[PDB]
Amino acid sequence: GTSQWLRKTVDSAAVILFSKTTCPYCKKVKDVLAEAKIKHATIELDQLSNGSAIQKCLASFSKIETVPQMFVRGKFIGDSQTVLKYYSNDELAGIVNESKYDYDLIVIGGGSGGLAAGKEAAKYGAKTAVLDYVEPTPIGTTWGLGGTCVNVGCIPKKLMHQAGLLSHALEDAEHFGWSLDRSKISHNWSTMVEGVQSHIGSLNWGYKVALRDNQVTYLNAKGRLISPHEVQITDKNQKVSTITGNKIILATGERPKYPEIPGAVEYGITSDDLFSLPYFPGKTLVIGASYVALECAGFLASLGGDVTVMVRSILLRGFDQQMAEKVGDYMENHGVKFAKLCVPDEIKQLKVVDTENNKPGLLLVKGHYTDGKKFEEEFETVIFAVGREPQLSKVLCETVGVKLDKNGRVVCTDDEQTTVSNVYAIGDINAGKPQLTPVAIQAGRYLARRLFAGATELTDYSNVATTVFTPLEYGACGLSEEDAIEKYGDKDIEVYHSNFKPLEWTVAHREDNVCYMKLVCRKSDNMRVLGLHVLGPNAGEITQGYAVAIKMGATKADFDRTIGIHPTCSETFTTLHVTKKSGVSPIVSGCCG
Amino acid sequence: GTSQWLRKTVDSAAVILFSKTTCPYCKKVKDVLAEAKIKHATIELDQLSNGSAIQKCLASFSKIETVPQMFVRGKFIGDSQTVLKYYSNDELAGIVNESKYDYDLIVIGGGSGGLAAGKEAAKYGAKTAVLDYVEPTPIGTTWGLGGTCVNVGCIPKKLMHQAGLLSHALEDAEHFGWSLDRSKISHNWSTMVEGVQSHIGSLNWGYKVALRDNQVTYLNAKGRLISPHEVQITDKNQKVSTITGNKIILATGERPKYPEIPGAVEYGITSDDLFSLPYFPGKTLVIGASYVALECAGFLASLGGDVTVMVRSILLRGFDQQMAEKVGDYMENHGVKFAKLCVPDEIKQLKVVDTENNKPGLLLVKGHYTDGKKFEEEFETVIFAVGREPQLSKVLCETVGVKLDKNGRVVCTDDEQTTVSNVYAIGDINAGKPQLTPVAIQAGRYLARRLFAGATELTDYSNVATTVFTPLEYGACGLSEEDAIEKYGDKDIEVYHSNFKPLEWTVAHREDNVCYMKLVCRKSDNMRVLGLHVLGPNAGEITQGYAVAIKMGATKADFDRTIGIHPTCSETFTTLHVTKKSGVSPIVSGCCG
Ligand SMILES: Cc1cc2nc3c(=O)[nH]c(=O)nc-3n(C[C@H](O)[C@H](O)[C@H](O)COP(=O)(O)OP(=O)(O)OC[C@H]3O[C@@H](n4cnc5c(N)ncnc54)[C@H](O)[C@@H]3O)c2cc1C
Ligand SMILES: Cc1cc2nc3c(=O)[nH]c(=O)nc-3n(C[C@H](O)[C@H](O)[C@H](O)COP(=O)(O)OP(=O)(O)OC[C@H]3O[C@@H](n4cnc5c(N)ncnc54)[C@H](O)[C@@H]3O)c2cc1C
Ligand SMILES: C[C@@H]1[C@H]2C[C@@H](C[C@H]1NCc1cn([C@@H]3OC[C@@H](O)[C@H](O)[C@H]3O)c3ccccc13)C2(C)C
Ligand SMILES: C[C@@H]1[C@H]2C[C@@H](C[C@H]1NCc1cn([C@@H]3OC[C@@H](O)[C@H](O)[C@H]3O)c3ccccc13)C2(C)C
């Protein structure tokens, strides 16, 4: 029965009020708690499906079945009459003072998932502490609250990709009858950086206002967990303190990697420096083939620069290789020099940085290919998106047993639960689960719901749709072609593929039959769609809806019976019939396939 | 069981071939037919639910169980031996090209649905004649083959839509570090006309090539049906001739109506004369509140010319009124006059059309509101968009019984079947079926499959999503708020609403909280999503993705389970929690809901 739910609720949370809609006394005590400015995790028993076992559990634990029953921090206050009596002597504010632990919940790391979990816990009754600190970049750049995705990540990346799309739109406007010259239009990088930084500062201020509104104690200081309840604090003023708390959330997030080569740390930069540096990188070298490196090089090239991507092994490792190759070809066509199959060796400085003149320095790069030829070049800026490593060592010494591989930090089971019962890890921390922003937010929210509200729903991690914001976006949800062939077998996987030219590219005279599209359908499950991909403009908007459709298993016949929206670039999804098994070329020019 | 499929196939389809995969003789006869360039509508017996029933029906009709069996007009030629002997004697072409009717299929109306049906029937082993003709009742520009959607309706609409969005993009490029002024930049409307007409001509050439490939004969002749198996046609040179056919497909479509008053025909223009108009309309009056009228007015306004919409009763009749008002306000905020609750009385001329230098002549408009106020203004052009009506009287003889309402339309049953057994109506004339291009295309393709290949699946006209390409696009799927309230009552309908802001509008300092999202769900069936609505940039892609999601039974909990794509607009649908019953303001700025 609901014995497990009652045990989970009573052993956690701050205040939980069991009530029903029919009983007027329950509504009265709810109103009394509301007018006292007391946040509570009320539960409606009548509307809950298991309306019988809850009464038995209440009789077993509270020794009384008369709802409403309000419970605080391991202490049973009593019925509505008891709460009214406590408020009569003005002790209701006094009795809501948490417990032996200083905080109901402490989040280490003010990232998107961390802040979402903090807000979710705060609006469910508990008093929450949030601890966010950013170790300064070796160059010296620093950002405020918001985490990686917000401060230096999702938002600035999309803003600069939109700038690149505007750059292409300037080219297309001449073919669209607008009196303007591409030779007479130039990009002011500094103004763009100032604007995006102003927007991100506004976002940080809004986040601070929101967190202080939910009665959440935020301290900008490094946190280091000592025991499953105790954590030490290193303030920016080196004022080390110590706070205890029953519930701990680990949201240390992630920090960009460096290659252990001479001169990389003191001369190179990462995404942390890229999104806030004043000058313009110009002739730029990018190290690493992760999707972040590719999109960064993409919108640096689209903004007048001439970037050289230096791929080590393969473009977009972990993604589908066919559309990875297509994306690389598109970058090559628009002025991106791909130094594939090469490995960096060392870097040096030739001309010192010119921060007084706001000009980038000059850096010499030495590397070697797979055959060891001495690759030599000079660049005005070198960016190291070689990967990302988490610094869980300096936040957890030996308290929790967390297995970690290369690029991994912890081992975690379902319900984001680690080995320690009262320690929870969300966001990028969990290994073997996607490192995305919405998944982190959902994990935090659902963790707060399960802890301080008694919820039973568990956050999903499968079929997580992603989109990379290259000059032309790539959005995928599900499985790749190679992954499907490896898992379900070559003969059990059917791929529906096509090439389409968006209606926005006709008069503009852009490239035709480049925007690719593919499906992954398995015959054993009635042509069930497994991996759905799109490559072209606004790929994320197209991909999100079809990810939603895939979530509960949309079949190929479902796509066939669905009717398109005219005119849109996504139409060809509901008109997919070409098969790779037949080998028919998907080059659709003029008349649609 | 399969008797009905067999009888409809033999009595309707042209060339049929019952065969299996395991039998090698069937593959041999397939190869023989392929070498003879005689395409066939083959059916794989071993790839169907009940092969034994098909074999029993064949024994009841073909008298022999041994597959394969090839049929022409349903006649039993025989087995593979008979077909091989006939091919050796070299008279199979005459056998397959002889019948009591001149053509197997006659399709009147060369629209997207018409060409789709023609190609689907042709590649399914049949001979078909597609007849299209356009009668320019106004001064007119007789566009070639391509139908309403391609020649006039859809493609030019989205082309000038992207022109308007490029106008907005140049306006907003100031904040993205682009060195221009938006004052020295002007517009070239003639460039619009020439480019869009060039693209239309390329599409027409592609369509002609496609119809030539599918061996379909196309004659630009007026269609006028006579008897259930014969039609008399009028060539371009007034050469009246007579053609008989086995089956008839009606795709007459519709043409814009006219508010018949003196001068409304010889002076004003409609959408037919809008997408090829040599001169820029400039200060324009728009008549009617249909989505075409608002789309055209927004196009001209964002292009630069001030426009005055003149709404009779309500904006966007048939859509949700809330977003209708929102979209109207969005045009109003960008310089679109709105003479709401007004109807026209007369139009006259002051200056003749100045065609020597391509300048529009001046016109005077007189009308009255609901209170009789004498509205009196001057416009050098008036565009009449008061809906479209079909000319069945010019295509269909009165001897056959059909139904027409005030707006026209043709009565028809579920399987696109008219009163006559071999006369079929698809496109914009079906009784109660949506007036959309994919509707016509799917209806034509599925009808051809059900006719000349014995298909079973029917085209779906339910939950047909749409998108109107106003300057702020509006895309909806399912139902509306008022429709849901009428259907199930207030207590059974729950609305989730959100006011969001695209990331592309942050630096640009565009409108905030203007964008909108609405979700209509029914409580009695597990919060099943009925009507979903989006109002923002690139709404068509989101709307189609979510229409595909909804069509196969998507609930709100399914939306919650989905992990969003960050950063885009569409993932805001996965964070829908505000309810209209609670009355919380949709406006979220920093917390973003
Ligand atoms: C350039 C770039 C682009 C990206 N684009 C996308 C994208 O489009 N979509 C997407 O889904 N994801 C994207 N990501 C990933 C995204 O940054 C993460 O997935 C997301 O931030 C994870 O959420 P979080 O709550 O862990 O936030 P995080 O930012 O990962 O949380 C880390 C925070 O905790 C703080 N912290 C760390 N250790 C401590 C400690 N001991 N004490 C106190 N505070 C501490 C850090 O200072 C930081 O503020 C991108 C990342 C980068 C670098
Ligand atoms: C301004 C405008 C915008 C539109 N935008 C959209 C949109 O965004 N999305 C969408 O889905 N739909 C849109 N439509 C609708 C779309 O144009 C039509 O619904 C589409 O053409 C339907 O296909 P059809 O079979 O009716 O072809 P149609 O082209 O409508 O009809 C076939 C053609 O045959 C002609 N014809 C008539 N009688 C005869 C005869 N006796 N012999 C020969 N030919 C004849 C007709 O005039 C017509 O041109 C729009 C329409 C207009 C006017
Ligand atoms: C669906 C989509 C589509 C795009 C490709 C991969 C997925 N998203 C990218 C991605 C997500 N993880 C996540 O970290 C590792 C795991 O923790 C997690 O399972 C995984 O989702 C990656 C890791 C390396 C490399 C790329 C990724 C594809 C085609 C299957
Ligand atoms: C989903 C969407 C959303 C937008 C509204 C209607 C649907 N599509 C618009 C529409 C489709 N028909 C079609 O022609 C008439 C009928 O033939 C057909 O049934 C109808 O779908 C219209 C007619 C007049 C006016 C608008 C329309 C709404 C809110 C339910």
Bin B481: left if φ > 0, else alpha if -120 < ψ < 50, else beta: alpha
Burial profile B225-235: b = 16 or more Cβ within 10 angstroms, e = fewer: beebbebbbee
Which atom of ligand 4 lies nearest, measured to the CA of B431?
Answer: 17
The two tokens of residue B199 are 């693209």
Q: Report the first-to-last Cα separation within chain A, whole angstroms.
A: 57
- DSSP assignment of A380-408 equals SEEEE-S-EE---TTTBSSSS-----TT-
Give the pairing of strands A255-256 and A41-44. Answer: unpaired
Establish whether A566 is a catalytic residue.
Answer: yes
Residue closest to A524 by CA, chosen among A552, A477, A488:
A488
Give every CB contact of residue B102 below 8 A, 6+ residues apart in sequence. B129, B243, B244, B245
CA B3/CA A323 separation, integer angstroms: 47
User: Residue A351's CB: how many other CB atoms inside 10 A?
Assistant: 12
Q: Please tell me which residue in A40, A334, A368, A566 is annotated as part of the active site.
A: A566
CA angle, residues A512, A513, A517, in degrees to nearest 5 = 140
CA distance A301 to A331: 9
A40 near A92, Cβ under 8 Å? no
**DSSP output for A451-497:** HHS--------SS--EEE-SSSEEEEES--HHHHHHHH-STTEE-BE
DSSP three-state, residue A291:
helix
Q: How many CB atoms lie within 10 A of CB B202?
A: 12
The owner of tokens 């609006």 is A123
- Cβ partners under 8 Å of residue A197, min gap 6: A276
The C-alpha atoms of residue B324 and residue A375 are separated, in whole angstroms, by 61
**Ligand 3 close to Cβ of residue A553 (< 6 A):** no
Question: Which residues lie closer than 8 Å to A593 by C-beta, 6 or more apart?
Answer: A498, A572, A575, A577, A578, A586
CA angle A229, A231, A237 (to 5 degrees): 160
Please tell me the distance in Å from B538's CA to the nearest CA on chain A: 8
What tokens were used for B384? 């009449």
A343: which strand partners?
Answer: A368
For residue B546, count CB atoms less than 10 angstroms from its CB and return exposed for 0-12, middle for 13-18, buried for 19 or more.
Answer: buried
Task: Find where tokens 């389409």 sit.
Answer: A500
Going from the C-alpha of B91 to that of each of B75, B365, B371, the distances in angstroms are 16, 69, 77
With H, G, I as helix, E, B as strand and everything else as coil, classify residue B379.
strand
Termini Cα distance of chain B: 56
Residue B98 has phi, psi (to 5 degrees) of -125, 130
The CA distance from A267 to A281, in Å, is: 13
Q: Within its chain, how far is the Cα of B467 from the centroid? A: 11
Contact predicate A436/A477, CB 8 Å: no
| CA proximity to A474, closest of A291, A237, A312, A310 | A291
Q: What is the largest CA-CA distance in chain B?
A: 84
Residue type, A139: I
Q: Binding site for Mg(2+): which residues of B?
A: 483, 509
Q: At B195, give phi and psi (nearest 5°).
A: -65, -45
Nearest-angstrom CA–CA distance, A270 and A281:
12
Instruction: Enumerate the residues of chain A whose CB falls inside 8 A of the CB of residue B567.
Output: 154-155, 158, 437
Return d(Cα A133, Cα A220) in angstroms, integer. Answer: 5
Looking up tokens 């957890």 gives: A396
Bridge partners for B218 per DSSP: B130
Contact by Cβ (8 Å): B321, B314: yes
* Stated length of chain A: 593
Axis crossing angle, helix B437-452 with helix B112-123, rounded to the nearest 10: 20
Dist CA B592 CA B590 (whole Å): 5
Contact A492, A522 (CB under 8 A): yes
Q: How far apart are CA B109 and CA B127, in angstroms?
A: 17
Question: Alpha-carbon dihedral of residues A94, A96, A101, A107, nearest 10 degrees?
Answer: -130
Question: Among partner residues A187, A203, A547, which is closest to B562 by beta-carbon distance?
Answer: A547
d(CA A547, CA A540): 10
In the reported structure, the alpha carbon of residue A42 is separated from the centroid of ligand 3 by a whole-number distance in angstroms of 38
Q: Which of A544, A569, A573 to mutate to test the interface with B (most CBs of B within 10 A)?
A: A544
Q: Which helix (H) or strand (E) segment is B19 a member of?
A: strand B15-19
β-pairing verdict for B388-389 and A15-19: unpaired
Provide, as residue numbers in chain B, all residues whose Cβ is less than 8 Å from the Cβ of A463. Answer: 563
Q: State the CB neighbour count (10 A cutoff) for residue B22.
A: 8
CB B500 within 8 A of CB B517: yes
B570 and A199 within 8 Å at the Cβ level: the answer is no
Pull the structure tokens for residue A209: 């206002």
Min CA distance, B265 vs chain A (Å)? 30
Is A552 within 8 Å of B547 when comparing Cβ atoms?
A: no
Question: Max Cα separation, chain A?
Answer: 84
Written as one letter, the residue type at A105 is: L
Residue B92, classed as helix, strand or coil, is helix
Tell me how far apart the alpha carbons of residues A147 and A314 are, in angstroms, rounded to a whole number. 29
> Going edge to edge, which strands form the sheet with B516-522?
B466-468, B474-477, B528-535, B516-522, B493-498
Rounded CA-CA distance B39/B214 in Å is 10
SS3 at position B421: coil
Please choose, from the candidates B452, B457, B562, B564, the residue with its C-alpha nearest in 3D space to the C-alpha of residue A558: B457
What span, in angstroms and rounded, lies between the C-alpha atoms of B133 and B109?
A: 7
In Å, how far are B267, B359, B360 from B356, measured between CA atoms?
Answer: 17, 8, 10
| Cis amide prior to A262 (ω within 30 degrees) | no
Nearest to A518, CA basis, from A506, A529, A502:
A529
Contacts of the segment A360-367: beta carbons below 8 A, 24+ positions apart: A360/A279, A360/A280, A360/A281, A360/A282, A363/A267, A363/A268, A365/A285, A367/A310, A367/A342, A367/A343
Is the peptide bond between A278 and the residue preceding it cis, with omega within 30 degrees of 0? no
Closest among B477, B463, B462, B464 to B535, alpha carbons compared: B477
- From the number of C-beta atoms within 10 Å of its C-beta (0-12, 13-18, 19+), residue B90 rates as exposed
SS3 A566: coil
Q: At what angle do helices B291-303 and B155-172 cross, to 10 degrees?
A: 40
**How far is residue A329's CA from residue A336's CA, in Å, rounded to a whole number?**
9
Contact A328, A334 (CB under 8 A): no
Cβ separation A542–B546 shorter than 8 A:
no
Which residues does residue A18 pair with via DSSP β-bridges, in sequence order? A43, A69
Half-sphere exposure (CA, 13 Å, Cβ side) for A431? 15
The phi, psi pair for A374, rounded to 5°, reads: -75, 90
Counting ligands in written order, the one closest to the CA of B461 is 4
Is residue A19 exposed (0-12), middle (13-18) or buried (19+ Cβ within 10 Å)?
buried
Instruction: Return left, alpha or beta for A417; rule: phi > 0 is left, psi -120 to 50 is alpha, else beta.
Output: beta
The C-alpha angle A579, A584, A585, rounded to 5 degrees, equals 110
Type of residue found at B532: L
Output the CA angle B73-B76-B82, nearest 5 degrees.
Answer: 120
Strand partners, A516: A499
CB B275 within 8 A of CB B196: yes
**How far apart are the C-alpha atoms of A107 and B504, rounded to whole Å?**
31
Contacts of B559 in chain A (CB under 8 A): 548
- Which pairs with CB-CB distance under 8 Å and at least 24 residues apart come from A389-393? A389/A254, A389/A255, A389/A256, A389/A257, A390/A252, A390/A253, A390/A254, A390/A255, A390/A428, A390/A429, A391/A135, A391/A252, A391/A255, A392/A250, A392/A252, A392/A429
Resolution to one decimal, Å: 3.6
Task: Map tokens 């009591």 to a residue.
Answer: B100
| Residue B137 contacts residue B159 (beta carbons within 8 Å) | no
CA–centroid distance for B587 within its chain: 35
Closest to A549 measured CA to CA, from A534, A535, A532: A532
**Spatial separation of the C-alpha atoms in residues A532 and B173, rounded to whole Å:** 33
Is A544's CB within 8 Å of B467's CB?
Answer: no
Assess contact for A124 and A39: CB atoms under 8 A. yes
B435, B493, B518, B551, best to mutate for ligand 4 pocket (most atoms within 8 Å of CB): B435
Backbone φ, ψ for residue B466 (5° rounding): -145, 165
Question: Is A306 in contact with A381 (CB distance < 8 Å)?
Answer: no
What is the number of alpha carbons within 13 Å of residue B219 lying toward its C-beta?
19
Cβ-based burial of A121 (10 A; exposed 0-12, middle 13-18, buried ≥19): buried
Encode B93-113: b = buried (16+ Cβ within 10 Å), e = exposed.
eeebeeeebbbbbbbbbbbbb
Rounded-to-integer distance, Cα A439 and Cα B2, Å: 50
**Residue from B13, B15, B98, B1 nearest B58 by CA:** B1
Instruction: Tell me which residue has tokens 């999601």.
Output: B549
Q: Please state, in angstroms and rounded to a whole number, the distance separating the CA atoms of residues B554 and B557.
A: 8
Whether A348 and A380 have beta carbons less than 8 Å apart is answered as: no
DSSP string, A145-194: SSHHHHHSSHHHHHHHHHHHHHHHHHHHHHHTTBS--GGG--B-HHHHHH
- Chain A positions touching B191 (Cβ under 8 A) are 176-177
Give the C-alpha separation, B41 to A547, whole Å: 36
Give the residue from A308, A431, A427, A320 showing the smallest Cα distance to A376. A308
CA-to-CA dists, residue A568 to A162, A541, A556, B544, angstroms: 20, 12, 20, 9
Across the interface, whether the CB atoms of A503 and B155 are under 8 A apart is answered yes
| Environment class of A473 (CB within 10 Å of its CB; exposed 0-12, middle 13-18, buried 19+) | buried
Verify whether ligand 3 is closer than 6 Å to residue A479 (CB atom). Answer: yes
